[PDB]
C-alpha cells in the first residue's frame, strides 16, 4: 500500500512534534556585554562658545 511520491512531493518542508524541550542556548553563549551608556538631553548652547584659545565665541 505505498505510492511513489510525486516530483517535489518529498521536498516541501514539513513539521513534526518533538516532546524534547527547546534548546534555549544552542551555542551555549555567555552573558552578552552591556551596551554603551545611553545619553540624552537637549542641546544647550556650548558654554562660552568655542572655548578655543582667545576666541570669545
Amino acid at each position: 500500500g505505498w505510492v511513489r511520491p510525486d516530483l517535489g512531493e518529498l521536498s516541501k518542508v514539513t513539521k513534526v512534534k518533538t516532546d524534547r524541550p527547546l534548546p534555549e542556548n544552542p551555542y551555549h553563549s555567555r552573558a552578552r556585554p552591556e551596551p554603551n551608556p545611553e545619553a540624552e538631553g537637549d542641546l544647550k548652547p556650548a558654554k562660552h562658545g568655542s572655548r578655543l584659545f582667545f576666541w570669545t565665541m
Binding site: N36, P37, A39, K47, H48, R51
Partner: protein, 63 residues
C-alpha cells in the same frame, strides 16, 4: 566712565575666563578618560554590525 564701570565689567571678565579655564581642564580629563575606558559617546571606534549575520538554517548543521 566711573571706576564702578570698569571694575564691574572686569570681574565679569574674570568670571567668564575662569568658567572657561576649569572647563578646559575638565575637557582634557574627560577626553583622556573617554579615550581610555571608552564607556561613553565619543572616541568609540567602529565595529561589525550584527545585521549582516544570517540565522536561517544552513546546508550542514551545527554551523
Amino acid at each position: 566712565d566711573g571706576p564702578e564701570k570698569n571694575y564691574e565689567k572686569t570681574m565679569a571678565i574674570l568670571q567668564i575666563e575662569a568658567e572657561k579655564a576649569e572647563l578646559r581642564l575638565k575637557e582634557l580629563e574627560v577626553r583622556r578618560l573617554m579615550r581610555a575606558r571608552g564607556d561613553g559617546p565619543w572616541y568609540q571606534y567602529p565595529t561589525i554590525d550584527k545585521a549582516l549575520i544570517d540565522h536561517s538554517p544552513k546546508t550542514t548543521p551545527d554551523n
